[PDB]
Amino acid sequence: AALVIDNGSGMCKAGFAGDDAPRAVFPSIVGRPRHQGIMVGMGQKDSYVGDEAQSKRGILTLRYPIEHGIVTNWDDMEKIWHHTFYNELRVAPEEHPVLLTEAPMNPKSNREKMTQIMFETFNVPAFYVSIQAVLSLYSSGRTTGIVLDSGDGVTHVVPIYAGFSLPHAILRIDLAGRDLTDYLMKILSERGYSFSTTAEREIVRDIKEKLCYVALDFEQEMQTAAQSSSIEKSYELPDGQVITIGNERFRAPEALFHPSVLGLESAGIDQTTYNSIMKCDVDVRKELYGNIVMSGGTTMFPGIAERMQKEITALAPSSMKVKIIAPPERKYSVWIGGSILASLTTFQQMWISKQEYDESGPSIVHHKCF
Amino acid sequence: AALVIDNGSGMCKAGFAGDDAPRAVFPSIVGRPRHQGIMVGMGQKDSYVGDEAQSKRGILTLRYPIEHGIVTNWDDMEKIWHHTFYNELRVAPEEHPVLLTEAPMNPKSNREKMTQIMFETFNVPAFYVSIQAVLSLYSSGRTTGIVLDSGDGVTHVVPIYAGFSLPHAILRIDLAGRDLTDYLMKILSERGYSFSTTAEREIVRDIKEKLCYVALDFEQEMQTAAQSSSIEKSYELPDGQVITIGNERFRAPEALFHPSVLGLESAGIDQTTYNSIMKCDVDVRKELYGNIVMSGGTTMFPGIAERMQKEITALAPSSMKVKIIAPPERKYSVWIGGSILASLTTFQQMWISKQEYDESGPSIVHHKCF
Amino acid sequence: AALVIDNGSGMCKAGFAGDDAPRAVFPSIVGRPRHQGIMVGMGQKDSYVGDEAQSKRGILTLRYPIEHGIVTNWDDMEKIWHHTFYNELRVAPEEHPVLLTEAPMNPKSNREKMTQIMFETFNVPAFYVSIQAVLSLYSSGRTTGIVLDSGDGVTHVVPIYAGFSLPHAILRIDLAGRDLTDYLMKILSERGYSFSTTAEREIVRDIKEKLCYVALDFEQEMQTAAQSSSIEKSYELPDGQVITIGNERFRAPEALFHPSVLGLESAGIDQTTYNSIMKCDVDVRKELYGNIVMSGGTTMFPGIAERMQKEITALAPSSMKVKIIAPPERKYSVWIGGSILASLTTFQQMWISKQEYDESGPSIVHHKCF
Amino acid sequence: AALVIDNGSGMCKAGFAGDDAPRAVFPSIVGRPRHQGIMVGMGQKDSYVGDEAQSKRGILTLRYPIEHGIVTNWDDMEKIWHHTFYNELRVAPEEHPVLLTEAPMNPKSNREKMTQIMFETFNVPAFYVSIQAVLSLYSSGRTTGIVLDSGDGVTHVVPIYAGFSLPHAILRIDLAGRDLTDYLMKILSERGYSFSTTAEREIVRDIKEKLCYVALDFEQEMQTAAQSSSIEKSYELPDGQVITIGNERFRAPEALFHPSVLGLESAGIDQTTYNSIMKCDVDVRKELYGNIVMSGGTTMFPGIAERMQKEITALAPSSMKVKIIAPPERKYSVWIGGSILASLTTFQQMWISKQEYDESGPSIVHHKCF
Amino acid sequence: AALVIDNGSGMCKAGFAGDDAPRAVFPSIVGRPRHQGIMVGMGQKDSYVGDEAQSKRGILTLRYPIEHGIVTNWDDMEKIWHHTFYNELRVAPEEHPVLLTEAPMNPKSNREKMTQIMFETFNVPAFYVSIQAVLSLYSSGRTTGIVLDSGDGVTHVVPIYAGFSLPHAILRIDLAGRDLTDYLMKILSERGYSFSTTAEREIVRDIKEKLCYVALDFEQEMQTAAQSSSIEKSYELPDGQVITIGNERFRAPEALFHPSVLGLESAGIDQTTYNSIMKCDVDVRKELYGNIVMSGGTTMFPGIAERMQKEITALAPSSMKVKIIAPPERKYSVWIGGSILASLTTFQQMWISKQEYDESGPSIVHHKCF
Numbered sequence A, B, C, D, E: 001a002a003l004v005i006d007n008g009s010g011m012c013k014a015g016f017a018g019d020d021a022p023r024a025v026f027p028s029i030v031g032r033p034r035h036q037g038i039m040v041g042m043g044q045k046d047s048y049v050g051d052e053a054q055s056k057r058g059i060l061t062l063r064y065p066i067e068h069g070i071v072t073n074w075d076d077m078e079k080i081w082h083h084t085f086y087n088e089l090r091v092a093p094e095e096h097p098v099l100l101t102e103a104p105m106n107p108k109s110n111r112e113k114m115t116q117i118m119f120e121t122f123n124v125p126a127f128y129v130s131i132q133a134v135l136s137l138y139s140s141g142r143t144t145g146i147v148l149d150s151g152d153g154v155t156h157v158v159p160i161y162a163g164f165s166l167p168h169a170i171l172r173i174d175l176a177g178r179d180l181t182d183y184l185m186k187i188l189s190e191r192g193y194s195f196s197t198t199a200e201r202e203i204v205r206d207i208k209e210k211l212c213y214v215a216l217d218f219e220q221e222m223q224t225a226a227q228s229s230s231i232e233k234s235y236e237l238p239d240g241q242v243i244t245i246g247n248e249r250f251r252a253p254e255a256l257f258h259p260s261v262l263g264l265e266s267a268g269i270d271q272t273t274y275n276s277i278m279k280c281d282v283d284v285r286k287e288l289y290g291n292i293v294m295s296g297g298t299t300m301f302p303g304i305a306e307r308m309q310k311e312i313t314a315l316a317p318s319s320m321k322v323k324i325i326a327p328p329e330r331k332y333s334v335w336i337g338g339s340i341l342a343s344l345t346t347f348q349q350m351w352i353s354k355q356e357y358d359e360s361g362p363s364i365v366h367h368k369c370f
């Protein structure tokens, strides 16, 4: 059986095919020491990965080797896969085909470089790469739908109808978990919590994943926050400091619908979604107002689905069955879908083999991999 | 018992002989994918037919393999019969003689090619082809009359008297449901509804079949539309958009009487009808001002019969019994007539047999088939 | 003397009648601030036009008020004419009749609204609107020809014979400079150049207008680009970044002949042209294979005329004198033609006057304006 | 005429509006006695300010009530304004509107508390607060630029284009005169000069402001200092001790470009500047590689501008007009700008009045003050 | 095996590596005669060391050649090592590598001079110097912690996390056993015990090391001493005089938390500790509120750990696991740690060799020694 890796921008997710739940999950980041290891007595190393990285942030600089789905640092990137194979899953990569994922319309160079690394350094027997949305759709068995995947690095809308892509209406957005965290960090610095080290950035991420939520009406909840204590929940900073976060718990996520606050010209996810639907033929729009499938951790806010519902119903003509699907498997949907795909017999012919790569090398992927 | 297929230009109609109602009806069109089927997991196909085609327009290009009664794409055409036999009626074509239909004066090549396909690929035991008008006349039992058949592809006038054809006065016209739909599409694009994909073309057809009607006086109803809301009915586009169509609901059908609007030099159906009557001997004109029988879906507009009545009475001398017959079976008249013909015992000698075709092949048909 | 404005979808062109060259040219766009003007000391404004807009893209959102020849934003549209009169040409609109242009079969509402604005707010003494193709034909003095006008917003084919229109064969296409720019933006994002702000969109337009060209054989030049450096010219992004564009320099324009790449079902300009010719009577087709006149900036690619020649000669029967005319005045042809028309004495009776509009208002235009 | 106070983190600067030069300058610090005043005969006091503080350091503890632009000690802070009004300028605060300044993105509480103090205790008639960068830009009349302000407490980069802020690209850094002094104190303690009382800290500041300079190449000048006397200039400690400072004269300022030496993860001013430029749209980057305006005393090192030039030109693409502007008015630029702003007539409507504050109190400022 | 010397400011501690207990301990002081040795008959000498010095204080002047970790008198300093090698341990220094210790941030000159003396005059085969805190941490095996070392000459706080130093948060204080003894001498002189010869100073040290203790509440125990006999313990001066010491038994040590009494501006050890913790990143503060390790004889007061606990818990946020570790090995911790370090095999490559010193001399140490 093959092996599935999502290579999520923010947190790698990996496991054996045919499993409904990912075995291994960890932050797709590396740790580099910035301080002198003068305590010779200990077996220190120049690099750290995942959990170890999280445990040592204050010693380390943190770098995300994936930005906006772009591998900007191949050397450190290799360590993520290296750890995933040799330490985490303890799997010989020569023994299994492997599946990878990428952002749509991602720069063609990187897919080649990725394939090169897989076939050369890990010497995998066979390989394939799929667009995340397709897998995430398989995770719900539907074959008519529109996917919002919103990982740490990108948010993109892909329509799929009866198993066909409509690439002319693929649309992507730079807003994602990372930049949303950056904005949250900014507004928190109107309180004393000014953070801004790469170490503290990761703690803001935790705070967001714990305590943020999406308002059904921005002016309503802003009024309530101006006029009540009740929103101003506490949180325990690791040093035991008590931070109180008010409207910011929602004023941040609001960016996904009014990105102008974040100074991005591109519209929010809802508006982009409507645009993409409208870019498709009128023959299909019905089914694409159904089957709005959320995916990825940025869809893990509470309330977000309701806001999307309300906005889309405000944009669509009435008497249209606007329906949003937000399964609780959202955070692992991509990997679930990949696990499903790898089990199909017919798909077993889809793999690119060692022989094929040897025949034409990386360029071959553009001919079959989608 | 034999089997009857109309092979209508726009929608195939098929069933067993001796039935007063056609069993199977579907659009005589094929669907070709234009977009990549990257969702391997699903069992997609390269071709679609009829209902499936209608259900997937936005994925597909649509092609009518019949134009103006001419089979321009024999390969895709074969699929229509193929579906009709094997899926729709679930009938072995070796077990039944089959009846087909054609436009009058249709190009002699195609009748041969059709016969070749029937006897070679479907290997039918016996075969015959009849001019649509004759069948449509049998559908009303009359044997003195003049038929207007106006399918999707052609409109033609055939007089028949006491069972005899008058081929010297056969007259055909290129105006038909398809080109009338095209014109309707044009004028709608003076509003925002500009459509013009092959997918949307089919929706214009539905709109026409739902909402168009024929004016008894063009200047009258144009004045009223200029001076009232009441004509400007709504329609629900499949995407839930609300389109409001005004005078266009009739300004389109008007083309059948003033084709100059459509830029065709040939006169309208009424004028052509009068011309054809006048081309016959004065011995018969009486009976041919009676027994104007409408046929085919373009005669399915409301009001059309009244307009024809008024025009013909304006052309004919007064004190002539201009009478128009518009049975509600219009839309299926051709197939009804064919079903009737196939039941006659004497007609059972009319069939061309496997033996006869083997004797002389396709050319044989010109000797007996009319 | 009257005044001529093209109101081109992408760039307004204006000047006095009787001039062979347009006096004033600027992008028909408005600029809206998205960022806070906290530097009170400066006299900022809420709106910007043309050159000012180009100079401030990074501050501004850009909106084209013309899409597909449709004025979708009348309020901002008014500013374009307002600037054109009061700042650019410095002309009192009460002192001169004015000529405007529109796409063929453009939605009838907008012509009325335009006339209303001209006679009410600008209070022009007299007014007329002409279809762009007719003017562009006058620009070459011919009176038998077929025009391809391909502005930023639309591309449409109009045949004209001896001064007569054949509206039944008018055909329009949504492909135009804007959507072609969008496609170019897409494929560039396979390299790192992902752009996609409304500001950067305008820079892609410049890049296209500088560096794109049409292949005489797609597979040939694709092979060469796969097998040579020589196509991969450089360009200097305004930030000094060096972008290298390869096959994309032509793979984009190719869309005009294989729009399926752009996911539009409608055929390319060549195929549409052949269709339109075939829609005309055989009496005229000879002259319409001559006198293929290019117009508008999308015809400003190098090589395009040759590709059209080769395609049309592949579609037409041989021994037909396929001839294409691509004067270097292409980019200003429409305005040139308008300048010519306004000088004719007989045309001076064609104008609609203040009196006439007062008599019947906007609806009057449909009776005389073509 | 209004009155302008910078409330600089390290040294208050104050004077009447419309003056090109600040009237009053003194260190924004308070002095508290730590030793018993047993010499009753003298009129001692529990508090000292500015010059008096400087004259008595050895008796006193010194506290900066401003840290990182944050007023951490409002009680002692009040004395700074109190002295400024009543002793220094000898001005009744009821007679003049007053202007104040703050760090960008400074914690929202403090702006309110400041306004409260101004309107309640000083009972000023009207008040306004501006971001330092904006004023410093007005000091050079430019309206396109990027400001580095680097006071004692903060260093922050703000881009401004044509008078518009781009808050999404505002970036701040904790490195500033104070912490740089602390580092200098540290390395001097590798020689005998170990200082580290709050009194001696102030003398290190003087030494820095007299004798430090920025290297154009760190390894070059380190080599020269390892291989020459010539850098090892003398200084006269107030007790007459002779201190010799070598490479430290530059190894300290180097921190602003390699803060890792100071153990801050955030990059240097140059890198941050490039990041901020890149955060702006490509429409404006050209003008922001021009008009790099230095401000505040940390930009008062010799050589710093050249180092910035070299670094930025190393980061920017070549053929970009990297230009740095370092007017000799740097040390007073903020106050100059404020003096200019207060003279503008239109700005006279910008003030918040006693009435407005009474209407809504401190919260009002967030609605108008930027 | 190598040899370990602490060169403690107040008492040298020396022995062979790999021993858990130091072999040799004596006061790091020299004795110089001030009185005429007229009793020729005896073999007197001009110098005395350690025990001999203690036995002859009344004849001698005593000088500490180490002050604040600074070797101020290299000539007399040499005798300490000279005695340590040749008399005390009876070891040839050519036969063993030797380890030394220094205060953090100690003036760079002295480390060089020390190395020079070791390699030149003692001609040791190999040498290394380590910061005291690191060794003292190894003495407890921990590798996350913060060390308070408080010898006779200095008290300094060093954080270490997972074996990494955070030099940016190293902080040192001049308060130490010597100056605390001086203060105790002062307050005793409010009783008759005015001492103040360099001889008597040493007896005050003994009294302190015997009879002082730290109050858990200063005002509490001051009240009790004002209201009870019970604190006023006796001591036997060497001349048999009976001295009674009351609150002074604690009013002295209190200086370490309220140094203002000693007229030092720098805060106490607790406050400095909190400051240092706060100077580290929030990623690590948790572990640094644990693992407060005491070291050196000034941590040998009873009660001190409890006072530190109470203060730190008063400064830290509650629900933080403030834990203090005060092993009874405190007084010898540094030497224990050094003994441990010298046994590690990997450390055996850390030594500087005779060859290396010969290559570059003293300056070499700054490249490897930490």
Ligand SMILES: Nc1ncnc2c1ncn2[C@@H]1O[C@H](COP(=O)(O)OP(=O)(O)O)[C@@H](O)[C@H]1O
Pocket (backbone or CB within 6 Å): A006, A007, A008, A009, A010, A011, A012, A150, A151, A152, A153, A177, A178, A181, A205, A208, A209, A210, A212, A295, A296, A297, A298, A300, A301, A331
């Ligand atoms: N409960 C949550 N609430 C808000 N944001 C979350 C939550 N869980 C995860 N996230 C965000 O989603 C990111 C991961 O999303 P994911 O789809 O896994 O991206 P990728 O697939 O590229 O790793 C996290 O880093 C975080 O920013």
Ligand SMILES: Nc1ncnc2c1ncn2[C@@H]1O[C@H](COP(=O)(O)OP(=O)(O)O)[C@@H](O)[C@H]1O
Pocket (backbone or CB within 6 Å): B006, B007, B008, B009, B010, B011, B012, B150, B151, B152, B153, B177, B178, B181, B205, B208, B209, B210, B212, B295, B296, B297, B298, B300, B301, B331
């Ligand atoms: N109710 C209706 N109103 C107007 N047009 C109709 C209606 N019903 C059918 N049509 C037109 O008639 C066409 C079919 O006519 P038909 O006689 O079946 O042609 P064919 O026999 O060649 O299939 C339809 O495609 C449509 O354009």
Ligand SMILES: Nc1ncnc2c1ncn2[C@@H]1O[C@H](COP(=O)(O)OP(=O)(O)O)[C@@H](O)[C@H]1O
Pocket (backbone or CB within 6 Å): C006, C007, C008, C009, C010, C011, C012, C150, C151, C152, C153, C177, C178, C181, C205, C208, C209, C210, C212, C295, C296, C297, C298, C300, C301, C331
């Ligand atoms: N040299 C060129 N090469 C390619 N495209 C061009 C060139 N010049 C102009 N264009 C395209 O043509 C557009 C303008 O064409 P135009 O006919 O003026 O449209 P309109 O008349 O509606 O303004 C430009 O915005 C650009 O997209």
Ligand SMILES: Nc1ncnc2c1ncn2[C@@H]1O[C@H](COP(=O)(O)OP(=O)(O)O)[C@@H](O)[C@H]1O
Pocket (backbone or CB within 6 Å): D006, D007, D008, D009, D010, D011, D012, D150, D151, D152, D153, D177, D178, D181, D205, D208, D209, D210, D212, D295, D296, D297, D298, D300, D301, D331
């Ligand atoms: N000539 C100089 N060289 C180096 N540093 C200087 C010089 N002059 C001033 N400084 C530093 O700049 C600080 C004051 O800068 P300033 O911009 O006034 O800060 P603020 O505006 O917050 O008072 C001084 O305290 C000192 O540290």
Ligand SMILES: Nc1ncnc2c1ncn2[C@@H]1O[C@H](COP(=O)(O)OP(=O)(O)O)[C@@H](O)[C@H]1O
Pocket (backbone or CB within 6 Å): E006, E007, E008, E009, E010, E011, E012, E150, E151, E152, E153, E177, E178, E181, E205, E208, E209, E210, E212, E295, E296, E297, E298, E300, E301, E331
């Ligand atoms: N039991 C004790 N109580 C109080 N102070 C002590 C005690 N033991 C030692 N000291 C103080 O600690 C000093 C020695 O501490 P130490 O850490 O050895 O300094 P160094 O390491 O520099 O020699 C002694 O000189 C004395 O002042």
Ligand SMILES: [Mg+2]
Pocket (backbone or CB within 6 Å): A006, A007, A008, A009, A132, A151, A296, A334
């Ligand atoms: Mg993912």
Ligand SMILES: [Mg+2]
Pocket (backbone or CB within 6 Å): B006, B007, B008, B009, B132, B151, B296, B334
């Ligand atoms: Mg039919």
Ligand SMILES: [Mg+2]
Pocket (backbone or CB within 6 Å): C006, C007, C008, C009, C132, C151, C296, C334
């Ligand atoms: Mg134009």
Ligand SMILES: [Mg+2]
Pocket (backbone or CB within 6 Å): D006, D007, D008, D009, D132, D151, D296, D334
């Ligand atoms: Mg300042």
Ligand SMILES: [Mg+2]
Pocket (backbone or CB within 6 Å): E006, E007, E008, E009, E132, E151, E296, E334
């Ligand atoms: Mg010691």
